[PDB]
């Protein structure tokens, strides 16, 4: 099937709210070895974040039930197996996306904003694996997540405007990794403060078209700082 028909099926599966179909279409676009345009990057990202978000939500509910059912053994042995069923789907989808990023997207990407976008994705999917992994596999996964975010940050600090929506997007998610995965709330506070202060100082240089996005992300960076400080 031709590339324009795969992209049109992805835009149709999005509106119909069938995200498992949308991800299969955008995987098939990605495997052709062409570099993606801005609409195609957004369709790939929206597809997989909806496919993973369902599993993250279900795993939190069933993992909570296994903490609450402290009394009864013949129930606990069912709760455990059902968590481990969900936990294996979550690990499969993250390894599906990390294969696209390693084999196709990052080795073709030859522009700063494009590399920062994919290195943020590589950071995020190792982060989602670290939410559910345990033992030496957690330590291995946490290292790979930090390596991806820092390489995005050494680019984004140098090649991009301090106000740019994806420089804000990277500073937001890299601060969440320090707060929730490395349990270092001081690093999370000072990073989020630094990025918010850098962005605020230069909004006078920014057109309304970009400012709409920058201010909407900057509010979330202030919300996290307010929660963590309170």
């Amino acid at each position: 099937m031709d590339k324009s028909e795969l992209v049109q099926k992805a835009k149709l599966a999005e509106q119909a709210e069938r995200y498992d179909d949308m991800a299969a279409a955008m995987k098939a676009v990605t495997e052709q070895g062409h570099e993606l345009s801005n609409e195609e990057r957004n369709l790939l990202s929206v597809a997989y974040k909806n496919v993973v978000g369902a599993r993250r939500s279900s795993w939190r509910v069933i993992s909570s039930i296994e903490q609450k059912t402290e009394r009864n053994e013949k129930k606990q042995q069912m709760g455990k197996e059902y968590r481990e069923k969900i936990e294996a789907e979550l690990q499969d989808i993250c390894n599906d996306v990390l294969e696209l990023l390693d084999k196709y997207l990052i080795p073709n990407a030859t522009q700063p904003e494009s590399k920062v976008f994919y290195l943020k994705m590589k950071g995020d999917y190792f982060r989602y694996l670290s939410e559910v992994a345990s033992g030496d596999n957690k330590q291995t996964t946490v290292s790979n997540s930090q390596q991806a975010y820092q390489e995005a940050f050494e680019i984004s600090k140098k090649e991009m405007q301090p106000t740019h929506p994806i420089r804000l997007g990277l500073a937001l998610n890299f601060s969440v990794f320090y707060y929730e995965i490395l349990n270092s709330p001081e690093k999370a506070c000072s990073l989020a403060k630094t990025a918010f202060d850098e962005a605020i100082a230069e909004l006078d240089t920014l057109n309304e078209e970009s400012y709409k996005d920058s201010t909407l992300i900057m509010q979330l960076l202030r919300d996290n700082l307010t929660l963590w400080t309170s």
Partner: peptide, 8 residues
């Protein structure tokens, strides 16, 4: 409670 970057 904590926010990560929203889906759009």
């Amino acid at each position: 409670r904590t926010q990560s970057l929203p889906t759009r």
